[PDB]
């Protein structure tokens, strides 16, 4: 279905958002 | 539908966050 | 739709979000 | 109707995070 | 219902990290 | 419902996020 | 159900997020 696949695309930009994070975190120490 | 446009532009929304995401990554390495 | 439109309203505040992260990532660079 | 105000609550609550990353944004320039 | 009330539970959590979000706005100009 | 309570899960990802950010604000101070 | 399910992606992402954050906060004090 169109809505869960719009959800679907909203999980994988948050997992897009959690790779950038951990490179920060990464990058701190 | 209107509510899966709209979910997916929350997506889009989350993807501008994580491009700018991945710039301050960037910019602390 | 009003369901629609609240939703609308959740990623134009993410876009809010976004254009403040990219300060952010213009002030580290 | 209740799912429509509980998700314009969300997009507030979004809006004070943006209120505050700009404050942010501030500080750092 | 469940569901509004579920989503009014996000709303909430999201107030809960503005408001660490202007603690950290605070410490950064203190 | 399975709906209801995979939003709960959000919620609960998000107060541990919150959490999170109150550590931080505490090592800033 | 599939919409159930999409939604407990976005829950997963959220907590990978906030392991990451975790590690901010301890980088910060470590």
């Known amino acids: 279905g169109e809505?869960?696949?719009?959800?679907?695309?909203?999980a994988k930009a948050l997992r897009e958002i959690a790779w950038?994070?951990?490179?920060?975190?990464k990058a701190l120490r």
Chains 1, 2, 3, 4, 6 share one sequence.
Do not use: N, S
């Not at 809505?3 to 909203?10: D, M, S």
């Open 20 to 25: 950038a994070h951990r490179e920060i975190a």
């Open 3 to 10: 809505i869960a696949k719009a959800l679907r695309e909203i």
